[PDB]
Write a protein that binds this ligand. Structure first.
Ligand SMILES: [Ca+2]
Ligand SMILES: [Ca+2]
Ligand SMILES: [Ca+2]
Ligand SMILES: [Ca+2]
Ligand SMILES: [Ca+2]
Ligand SMILES: [Ca+2]
Ligand SMILES: [Cl-]
Ligand SMILES: [K+]
Length: 233
């Protein structure tokens, strides 16, 4: 007679497992262990995921029915999905029906630095540069505006974004702070030169410097255009 139900020993109920994202196929994740103190088959334990809920996170993993080893079955990308919900099942092999026990388990992916700062180009047809405007004859240091649009898909210190002029301001009309603040250096006159164009690099490298620059293919770059607003002078 099948007296005992299997009892999970590991993991503990409600534990959130933390693994690195982007670990290769069939990487080892966890050793599940449940015990059953019954005689022979009534006390043999077999491991599975529950696959009958609407939650299909089980597709990312396998569990060995005998050893309880969970391995990865697919790419684990934290930027695609950060948390994965599994329901562990431990079954004995009882007479016409086994007793089974279930234990929810969450797996959370720790971020790695596998993305760089990238712009997204305005839709085809509309101008491909970020536009900034300043009054002509603005004094030295005047905020022209904030260059922006570059995002790093990583987390915290893996997602630092800095902006740098890559090319196009040989006259030193502007200074670009690494935070994206674009400032006036020189006296700018609408009635002489009313428009400026140059290229900015977004980088996580605080000490990036210019080294051939293709704005169609390289989304770490964008064009910035500055126009001077009219003063009555
Ligand atoms: Ca049993
Ligand atoms: Ca990733
Ligand atoms: Ca990054
Ligand atoms: Ca990442
Ligand atoms: Ca003027
Ligand atoms: Ca004017
Ligand atoms: Cl204007
Ligand atoms: K402005």
């Amino acid at each position: 007679v099948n007296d005992n139900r299997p009892v999970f020993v590991r993991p503990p109920n409600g534990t959130i497992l933390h693994i690195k994202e982007e670990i290769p196929l069939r990487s080892n994740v966890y050793e599940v262990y449940a015990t059953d103190n019954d005689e022979g088959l009534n006390g043999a334990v077999r491991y599975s995921f529950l696959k009958t809920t609407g939650n299909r996170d089980w597709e990312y993993f396998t569990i060995d029915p005998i050893s309880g080893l969970i391995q990865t079955a697919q790419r684990l990308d934290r930027e695609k999905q950060a948390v994965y919900s599994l329901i562990l099942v431990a079954s004995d092999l009882g007479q016409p029906v086994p007793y089974e026990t279930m234990q929810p388990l969450q797996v959370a992916l720790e971020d790695i630095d596998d993305n760089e700062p990238l712009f997204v180009r305005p839709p085809k047809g509309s101008p491909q540069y970020q536009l900034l405007t300043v009054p002509e004859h603005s004094p030295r240091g005047t905020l022209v505006g904030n260059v922006t649009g570059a995002v790093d898909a990583d987390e915290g210190p893996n997602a630092i974004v800095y902006y740098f002029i890559a090319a196009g301001d040989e006259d030193k009309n502007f200074h670009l702070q690494p935070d994206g603040r674009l400032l006036v250096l020189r006296d700018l006159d609408r009635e002489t030169e009313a428009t400026f164009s140059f290229i900015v690099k977004a980088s996580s490298n605080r000490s990036w410097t210019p080294p051939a620059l293709d704005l169609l293919t390289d989304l770490t770059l964008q064009e910035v255009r500055v126009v001077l607003e009219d003063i009555n002078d």
